[PDB]
Subunit: 162 residues, 3 copies
């Protein structure tokens, strides 16, 4: 008896052809919410919109340029996927497929604004944890100087998500 | 009636076995051309050879070490895939599978040369656009100093390409 | 006559359903051994544990924070997968699927310790070669200062495997 096929595999009945679904290589969405920065001496919330892309067994988060308040030498960022996901996306779709820490690391290019001067620097960001829809991205450090505001260039980060 | 299979799925007729093609996990090539740097105050073309690799639904570009003329604080790099691709590759094979911007970001390690002195720095590069075979990689910034020449360490960048 | 299926494809006989194996999207392991640093003027070995993850046709190496001896402006790191792999993993499972150099590059955030002072900097790391179980990660450079010790923040690197 002929088998059925489980996603990403699918049967195209018009041509009687088994294939990998086109959505598997690319599924887009957006998340609109508040990016939370957390540190014992400083915490804030900034309104952001991220582009999302599921590519095979990976989830890619794409940040456009942003201006945020000042940050400490290290700290953590939290994205709450409980609300804000575009249609077709469920909170569970952002859950990592492993509990290894870090799952992924990337660098974000920033300018620290101090007085009137812009100081180019970097921030190392690690996907560290997911708990009931809340994704934790730890900022371990990077180059630092005293500042009043942060200009973040665009950046992407991805993690295994199946 | 028995179905047919669409790439990356294939039927190995010798053993009557359905499998994912071996080329899906790795398909190599090269691109030989001129890397274009663009900025309103400074533009140039540098002869380069890139190694390419299609890994699942991703395209990886691999740059070897290079020496280029000086650059501005920000600007853009253009790779014209209209010509220069090795055999088996078509221009269309480099097209991203989404219009999200940035699709991907990476850091390139550089040394800025300022008459004898080598100044270590970084450049953030973002895959930004593809138009009729021309790939645009924006350089948002990074650390900077006045210089006459740039020594680029090797780097890779990848983007969803299905 | 009905075909058979080669991994990652599999037939779930209970439901007569063809699927991609769940392990294909994620297979974990660990490697315990000595990370080797090599340079003509300075060489050392440091005891480390890495987390590994096979994700589709990629292998991800995940480093936790570490403190190592000093390093030169450039040099190379060698991970010997001949021993130390957790159960279910063979040395051959870490072999890259191409000889292109670099296969992948990433940045590691560090602090260079110069007797009391911590200097934030970066290191560019490239997956460069694999020879009989020995993976070579070249450190092309990055920002640098004279130092006595290195504090490395956690980092991941991956390559087609
Ligand atoms: Cl859900
Ligand atoms: Cl074409
Ligand atoms: Cl083996
Ligand atoms: Mg402030
Ligand atoms: Mg010049
Ligand atoms: Mg020492």
């Amino acid at each position: 008896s002929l088998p059925t096929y489980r996603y990403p595999l699918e049967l195209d009945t018009a041509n009687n052809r088994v294939q990998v679904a086109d959505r598997f290589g690319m599924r887009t969405g957006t998340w609109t919410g508040q990016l939370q920065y957390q540190h014992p001496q400083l915490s804030w919330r900034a309104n952001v919109t991220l582009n999302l892309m599921k590519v095979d067994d990976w989830l890619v988060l794409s940040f456009s340029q942003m201006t945020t308040n000042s940050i400490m030498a290290d700290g953590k960022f939290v994205i709450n996927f409980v609300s804000g996901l575009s249609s077709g996306w469920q909170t569970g779709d952002t859950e990592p497929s492993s509990t290894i820490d870090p799952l992924s690391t990337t660098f974000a290019a920033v300018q620290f604004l101090n007085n009137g001067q812009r100081i180019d620097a970097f921030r190392i960001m690690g996907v560290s944890e997911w708990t009931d829809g809340e994704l934790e991205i730890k900022n371990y450090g990077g180059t630092y100087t005293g500042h009043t505001q942060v200009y973040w260039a665009p950046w992407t980060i991805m993690y295994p998500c199946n």
